[PDB]
């Protein structure tokens, strides 16, 4: 009991089990560790980043290897619409003969792959279980590279200084140009060279790539400027993916819409997209100043941006030193951007499927959308939590203030009451009225008179759909009109492909919407606004309030301020994150429920079921949950079991973890300390067990630890039960 | 890049003069012991105790490989596969088309014999106070001194003799595995070739 | 030794032996003194 929390002497002197619990939960809070400097902080974060990237690459290599070894990738190539992809084999000694038989796929029990990796790897030009093995080998090599780099940059002569870590202009130039633009350029190179011929039956491997021309003219049009030659003769409308029948020779085209066979974006479209992105990012990577006297100094840009009339105070003068010296501001910005980006991925990979035959893989579509939306919610909550942490421990009012006047960030704490009050008003407005309309529909339909329902046509959103070319709402607006300047401009470039895809009932591109979509979008807006209210209130009130005008002196995470002055439960900024996690889970649940029910009705064909029953709550409860839960719960019955048996077990497991979270959330400490004391007395006063005594005094979990454990149980149960439900329902309903 | 130093002057490598001379074996041992204490103090890793124990096991295993070859050649080593109905589905290896290929019964028997020997080893490990030679080093005990390139030529039942024979047996196992991997035959096939034919006869 | 014997060789190994040794090491480490 003197060397586990090596980074904290205060914890290492704790005689109780709290030392072990807090040793885990404070291991990555490097700024709070004993004998801590900024240089060591940045160096340790750098090495941890290297180890993390190595972990990511090892995970991808493992996926590749297990698909290559125990999957059916090669068989799935020849029949992608009937063969179900296999993730990996199963060896579990607890299986009975029935479980072995039900999970048996080809040669061994195996799990279907819901990650969509088969379609992704097939699209980028993989046709052999030896191509996957090469990828796994290369990724393990890259992981070894990253681990070696992480070790190296902790060595004495190779540890970077604070100036290098805080060199904003150099890092931005390189990140933007090199990372984004050059990675897009290399991806365009791969796309063209390998993927484009492989979709046309020509194999371009690591042997015949220096001799197989990606285009017949071969780099002559690029240098000659005849760039149109790369767009001539695109893939026809009768092209069979992976075969030369009906193929073309173009490598960079505008076609819009989807491939007629795979129902996915054209490979030549994506290569052109990545080439354009590469050029744009390489250009944008020269903005900031470096050792060659030209570029921008972002301190000057920030300082010079003060509106002349004066409404943002003194502008952004103190923001450069504020962001540079704080790792929580940057982390919050990065997390917010990543959350928006993965929300974008979720919202675009279902409307615009980019991988061949992924549109017809309904379980993987649902799994991908749900996974990315949950990750998005997590990232957004993390961004706001780290903003609150920045307020608590990194914000300096003196830097953000010049002669009494406050800069753009410090002014957010002046009208903080206005911001919180208006967030509260919007949340109450949306909640009151969305619930009112939903309950009105509930009562009116229940009384047998559905005609009295309040159904608001989402005209604003249908207006946007018509603007993009959907001739379904009779708006004749911009691209629904053939005479508008928006249509004549692109009538020869990408409208014929785009219009043919948007005006198709079998796509998810701009799904038709009705009053149910209106109501559920308002519910989503309410969830977003309430989660934002909780997080913004916690961030702004992090440094203090009327109930605790010295909250900054207690840190980001503390249990409370006591029992007097009223009370003081959940007063810290960490508690705001803790409360907003429930609202994030609820909002993501609403979003994923809406998406999954809409797509289940679209795939099954009974879109009239959603359009009618989605306007009232009992419609949701009866036709989504109760209706589609039947295949899942019958994964094993007193008569037998199916391959969905694991999903029913996970369903029950998620319910159990959810209710254990309920334990940890409803029942607080103090009730568990006295019980533990009784147990301690019982152990101390019993023979044959007095010979064994604890080294750490058993104590109840701390208030903050209990909140974290209850939140973890709640979230894990939530995620597990919904994943089981969505996957099993899709599989058991749509064959 | 230019207006600052990537590596601070206070964080620079210093040449370790404490390893002057100190042939690669001594240098490697010292580096392992300094870098990984509490596993070096136990005698684990590149240590004379570990080398002696592994040599003993390698010699005994050369004996075991000879015995296994003899048993395979002489009609011993039971035939068939394990009964999945008797030993559960964990003994099933694959199902090609309607038949369950199980773990061979010979493999199960050999695993049981190896389990006997490994159990004896585990007992001796958790019997430190009653065995002549312990598995690990006591706190304070110091690792016997490395024998060097050539251990002393002391015939009989001597520490040097056992040391040399253990090194020879471990090298023989390394060579056997290398030959089997490079050429592509079974381990017992390589042993049979290396005995002329007197084993699998 | 075929490739299909690798699951039966590795899954017990990892999923039982690695917990045992990891628990031994972690318990020893967190119960150390100074």
């Amino acid at each position: 009991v003197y060397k586990f929390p090596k980074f904290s002497k205060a914890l290492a002197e704790d005689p109780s089990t709290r030392r072990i619990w807090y040793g885990i939960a404070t291991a990555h809070d490097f700024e709070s560790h004993d004998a801590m400097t900024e240089s060591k902080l940045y160096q340790k974060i750098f090495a941890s980043h290297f180890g993390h990237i190595a972990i990511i690459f090892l995970w991808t290599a493992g996926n590749l290897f297990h698909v290559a070894w125990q999957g059916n990738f090669e068989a799935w190539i020849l029949n992608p619409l009937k063969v179900r992809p296999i993730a990996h084999a199963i060896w579990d000694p607890h299986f009975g003969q029935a479980a072995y038989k039900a999970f048996l796929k080809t040669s061994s029990p195996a799990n279907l792959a819901l990650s969509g990796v088969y379609e992704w790897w097939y699209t980028i030009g993989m046709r052999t279980n030896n191509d996957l093995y090469q990828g796994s080998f290369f990724l393990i090599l890259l992981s070894s590279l990253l681990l070696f780099a992480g070790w190296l940059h902790l060595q004495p002569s190779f540890r970077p200084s604070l100036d290098w870590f805080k060199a904003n202009e150099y890092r931005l130039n390189h990140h933007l140009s090199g990372l984004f633009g050059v990675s897009s350029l290399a991806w365009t190179g791969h796309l063209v060279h390998v993927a484009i011929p492989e979709s046309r039956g020509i194999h371009v491997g690591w042997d015949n790539f220096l001799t197989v021309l990606p285009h017949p003219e071969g780099l002559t049009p690029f240098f000659s400027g005849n760039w149109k030659a790369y767009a001539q003769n695109p893939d026809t409308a009768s092209h069979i993916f992976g075969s030369g029948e009906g193929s073309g020779t173009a490598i960079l085209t505008f076609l819009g819409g989807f491939h007629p066979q795979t129902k996915s974006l054209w490979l030549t479209d994506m290569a052109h997209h990545h080439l354009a992105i590469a050029v744009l990012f390489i250009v944008a990577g020269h903005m900031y100043r470096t050792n060659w006297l030209i570029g921008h100094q972002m301190k000057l840009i920030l300082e010079a941006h003060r509106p002349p009339g004066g409404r943002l105070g003194i502008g952004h003068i103190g923001l450069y030193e504020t962001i540079t010296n704080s790792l929580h501001f940057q982390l919050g910005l990065a997390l917010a951007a990543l959350g928006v980006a993965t929300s974008l991925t979720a919202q675009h990979m279902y409307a615009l499927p980019p991988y061949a035959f992924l549109a017809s893989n309904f379980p993987t579509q649902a799994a991908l959308y749900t996974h990315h939306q949950y990750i998005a919610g997590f990232l957004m909550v993390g961004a706001f939590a780290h903003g609150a942490i920045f307020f608590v421990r990194d914000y300096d009012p003196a830097v953000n203030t010049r002669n009494g006047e406050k800069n753009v960030l410090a002014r957010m704490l002046e009208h903080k009451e206005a911001i919180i009050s208006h967030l509260s008003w919007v949340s109450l407005f949306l909640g009151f009225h969305t619930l009112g309309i939903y309950v009105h529909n509930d009562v009116v339909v229940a009384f047998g008179q559905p005609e009295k329902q309040i159904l608001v046509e989402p005209l604003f959103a249908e207006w946007i759909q018509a603007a993009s070319g959907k001739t379904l709402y009779n708006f004749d607006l911009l691209l629904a009109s053939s005479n508008s300047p928006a249509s004549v401009a692109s009538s020869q470039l990408w409208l014929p492909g785009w219009l043919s895809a948007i005006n198709d009932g079998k796509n998810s591109l701009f799904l038709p919407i009705g009053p149910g979509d209106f109501l559920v979008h308002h519910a989503i807006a309410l969830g977003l606004h309430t989660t934002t209210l909780i997080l913004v209130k916690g961030a702004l009130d992090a440094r203090g309030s009327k109930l605790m005008p010295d909250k900054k002196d207690f840190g980001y995470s503390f249990p409370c301020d006591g029992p007097g002055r009223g009370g003081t439960c959940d007063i810290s900024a960490w508690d705001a994150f803790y409360l907003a996690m429930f609202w994030m889970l609820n909002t993501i649940g609403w979003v994923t429920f809406y998406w999954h029910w809409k797509h289940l009705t679209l795939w099954q064909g009974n879109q009239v079921q959603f359009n009618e029953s989605s306007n009232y709550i009992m419609g949701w409860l009866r036709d989504y949950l109760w209706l589609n839960s039947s295949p899942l719960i019958n994964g094993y019955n007193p008569f037998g079991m199916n391959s969905l048996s694991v999903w029913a077990w996970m369903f029950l497991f998620g319910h159990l973890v959810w209710a254990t979270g309920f334990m940890f959330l409803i029942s607080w400490r103090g009730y568990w300390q006295e019980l533990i004391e009784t147990i301690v007395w019982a152990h101390e006063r019993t023979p044959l067990a007095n010979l064994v005594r604890w080294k750490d005094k058993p104590v109840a979990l701390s208030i903050v630890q209990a909140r974290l454990v209850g939140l973890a149980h709640f979230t894990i149960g939530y995620v597990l039960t919904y994943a089981a439900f969505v996957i099993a329902s899709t599989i058991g309903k749509l064959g | 890049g230019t207006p600052f130093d990537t590596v601070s002057k206070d964080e620079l490598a210093v040449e370790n003069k404490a390893m002057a001379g100190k042939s690669v074996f001594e240098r490697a041992m010292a580096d392992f012991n300094g870098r990984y204490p509490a596993v070096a103090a136990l005698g684990l890793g590149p240590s004379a105790k570990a080398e002696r124990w592994n040599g003993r096991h390698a010699m005994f295993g050369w004996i075991v490989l000879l015995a296994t070859g003899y048993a395979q050649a002489h009609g011993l080593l039971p035939e068939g596969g394990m009964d999945a109905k008797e030993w559960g589905t964990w003994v099933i290896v694959s199902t090609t088309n309607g038949e369950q290929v199980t773990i061979p019964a010979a493999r199960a028997a050999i695993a049981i014999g190896h389990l006997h020997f490994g159990a004896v080893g585990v007992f001796a490990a958790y019997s430190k106070n009653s065995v002549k030679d312990r598995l690990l080093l006591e706190p304070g005990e110091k690792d016997e001194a490395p024998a060097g390139l050539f251990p002393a030529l002391r015939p009989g039942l001597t520490k040097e003799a056992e040391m040399l024979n253990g090194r020879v047996a471990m090298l023989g196992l390394v060579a056997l595995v290398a030959v089997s991997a490079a050429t592509g035959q079974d381990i017992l096939s390589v042993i049979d070739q290396g005995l002329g034919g007197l084993l699998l006869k | 030794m075929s490739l299909d014997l690798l699951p039966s060789f590795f899954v017990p190994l990892v999923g039982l032996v690695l917990p045992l040794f990891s628990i031994i090491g972690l318990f020893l480490y967190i119960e150390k003194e100074n």
């Binding site: 090596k6 090495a47 180890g51 279980n129 093995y133 080998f137 070894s144 681990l147 | 870098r35 990984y36 | -």
Partner: peptide, 30 residues
């Protein structure tokens, strides 16, 4: 179907990546 040699050398390379991982783990200190 991948061969025994392919899986074996991938396992050996994985071992090398493991020794590199503990070296990074031990260098990030106890």
């Amino acid at each position: 179907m991948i061969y025994d040699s392919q899986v074996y050398i991938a396992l050996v390379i994985a071992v090398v990546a493991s020794v590199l991982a503990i070296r990074l783990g031990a260098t990030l200190y106890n």
